[PDB]
Amino acid sequence: SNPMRVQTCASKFRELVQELTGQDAVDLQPEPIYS
Amino acid sequence: KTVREPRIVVQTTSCIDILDDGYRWRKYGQKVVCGNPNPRSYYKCTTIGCPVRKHVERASHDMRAVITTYEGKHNHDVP
Numbered sequence: 001s002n003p004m005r006v007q008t009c010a011s012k013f014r015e016l017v018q019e020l021t022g023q024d025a026v027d028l029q030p031e032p033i034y035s
Numbered sequence: 036k037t038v039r040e041p042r043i044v045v046q047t048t049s050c051i052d053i054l055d056d057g058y059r060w061r062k063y064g065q066k067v068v069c070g071n072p073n074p075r076s077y078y079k080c081t082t083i084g085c086p087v088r089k090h091v092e093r094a095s096h097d098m099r100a101v102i103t104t105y106e107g108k109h110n111h112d113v114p
């Protein structure tokens with residue numbers, strides 16, 4: 001599992017894209033077990 | 036120019052779809068989605084002269100995945 005991001009993107013950014021913008025989204029880290 | 040301002044999307048993981056964003060809101064309605072029991076709820080800013088909206092949903096494939104979609108930007112830093 002990867003841990004609960006919760007508030008990580010709740011910042012008041014100015015732009016159209018928040019800093020952790022992905023494919024709406026995936027954890028970029030390596031999986032320690034099968035998918 | 037590339038279209039984004041209508042559909043400012045923000046993803047997170049959480050044990051529930053109650054989340055903070057530092058702004059103040061009223062809810063104007065709700066619709067159903069596939070694959071999840073919770074409705075999507077829609078909101079509007081309560082700041083004077085602010086025409087910003089959002090909608091908030093859990094995903095189908097997990098209990099733990101949650102997405103907000105905003106429409107327009109708030110020119111105010113105060114909630």
Ligand SMILES: [Zn+2]
Pocket residue numbers: 058080081082085086087109110111
């Ligand atoms: Zn506002």
